[PDB]
Structure 1
Amino acid sequence: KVFGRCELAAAMKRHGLDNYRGYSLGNWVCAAKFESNFNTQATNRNTDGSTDYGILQINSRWWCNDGRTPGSRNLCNIPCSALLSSDITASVNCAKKIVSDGNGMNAWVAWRNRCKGTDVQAWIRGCRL
């Protein structure tokens, strides 16, 4: 499912994302945009063997199990295919444990590099929220 901007915002806000750990909704929506393009089915292989999954490109190294990332963890307690689902709940619930990890949303490369310190509200401008 290729989410629409304001659609995704509504759905993150509902899953308790807006202002989670101090990160207003425009953050997460930006992150999504850049990590994944609002596509729930997006993957990328990392050079080390890991694969990033879904709307926020959560990574198999630490966070989920795809059973081809040797030496990796599965700290969210899910298979990685649950992150490609058109429902985003797993994705969101995982984000909560990652964002809470002490690097904040620096955990998301795209975010730190492309959203951090910009006007993130622009991404929620025009939204029935």
Structure 2
Amino acid sequence: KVFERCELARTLKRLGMDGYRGISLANWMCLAKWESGYNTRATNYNAGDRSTDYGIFQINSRYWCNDGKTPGAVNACHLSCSALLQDNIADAVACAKRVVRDPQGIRAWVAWRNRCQNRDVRQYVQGCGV
């Protein structure tokens, strides 16, 4: 599914994302916006290293989920990458929380550095009741 902006904001808030390991809701929104356009079903193959990015946060198969087909990979979220293509984003959120328990936190995603870091991201949550 493709979330509407404010629907997603509230959904993430219910799932405990607001301020998780220091990360505001507007940061998570900015990440989802630029990774996927708020789209849970998105996959992107990285021909360079044979990994794939999955779902609304575009979580990568080399480190985070198992797809069977990524050489040398591990699965720190202990999930099938299939779990990250559901309309229900609970598993994706749990896996995003796992990513940001590592030292880089939200910097793990390059798109966040590019599109969100050191910016005014308040627009992402404006009017959403969060």
Give the TM-score category using the shorter length.
over 0.9
Residue 87 of structure 1 and its aligned partner are, at CA, apart by 0.2
Percent of pairs identical after alignment? 60
Task: Give unmatched runs, 5+ long, in structure 2.
Answer: none
TM-score (normalised: structure 2): 0.97
Taking the aligned partners of 2:110 and 2:14, their CA distance within structure 1 comes to: 25
Q: How does 1:40-51 map to 2 (within 5 A)?
A: 40-46=40-46, 47-51=48-52
Aligned partner of 2:56 in structure 1 is 55
Figure out how many residues of one structure are paired with residues of the other and give that number.
129
Taking the aligned partners of 2:110 and 2:4, their CA distance within structure 1 comes to: 22
3-state SS of paired residue (2:49): coil
Aligned partner of 1:72 in structure 2 is 73
Aligned partner of 1:19 in structure 2 is 19
Residue 128 of structure 1 and its aligned partner are, at CA, apart by 2.4
3-state SS of paired residue (1:62): coil
TM-score (normalised: structure 1): 0.98
3-state SS of paired residue (1:45): strand
1:39 aligns with 2:42: no
Aligned partner of 1:126 in structure 2 is 127
3-state SS of paired residue (1:12): helix
1:8 aligns with 2:11: no
Taking the aligned partners of 2:118 and 2:42, their CA distance within structure 1 comes to: 25
Taking the aligned partners of 1:98 and 1:66, their CA distance within structure 2 comes to: 17
Aligned partner of 2:116 in structure 1 is 115
1:69-93 alpha-carbon deviations (Å, 9 max, x no partner): 0100001010001101000001000
Taking the aligned partners of 2:129 and 2:22, their CA distance within structure 1 comes to: 21
For the aligned residue pairs, the C-alpha RMSD in angstroms reads 0.7
